[PDB]
């Protein structure tokens, strides 16, 4: 793979909404990116917590597979978990700046249970 691959996958799984929206490009352009071989496989959602309201959190997972796959096949999983397990719940949290009220702090609510479902792991 190309030699900055490792800065590539570090500016893809920040916190901030500069990198969700650099992944988020990369992700609607996979192919742009093959050079890199990264893994693009997700599960979505399908293997957090319950979701009653249906707040749209396919895309905070996505990114999240995202990290967990490519760090994990880098054989550096352990030392990047928490940036993306944060990454993660701000993702989550940007969903939900787009509601207010009770809503507002439901979807606050379940982000914070996806997040606490995944940060049980370490």
């Known amino acids: 793979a190309p030699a900055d691959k490792p800065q590539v996958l570090a500016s893809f799984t ?17 192919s742009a990116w093959a050079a890199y071989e990264f893994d693009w496989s997700t599960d979505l959602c399908t293997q957090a917590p ?6 749209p959190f396919n895309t905070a997972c996505a990114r999240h ?16 978990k928490s ?19 009770e809503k507002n702090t439901a979807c606050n609510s379940t982000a914070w249970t996806y997040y606490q479902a995944v940060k049980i792991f370490g």
């Open 50 to 55: 319950d979701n009653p309201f249906g707040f």
């Open 83 to 101: 940036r993306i397990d944060s990454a993660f719940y701000e993702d989550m949290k940007r969903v939900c700046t787009g509601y207010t009220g």
């Open 65 to 80: 597979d995202f990290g967990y796959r490519n760090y994990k096949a880098a054989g550096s999983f352990d030392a990047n």
């Open 14 to 30: 920040q916190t901030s909404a500069s990198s969700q929206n650099a992944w988020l490009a990369a992700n609607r352009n996979q």
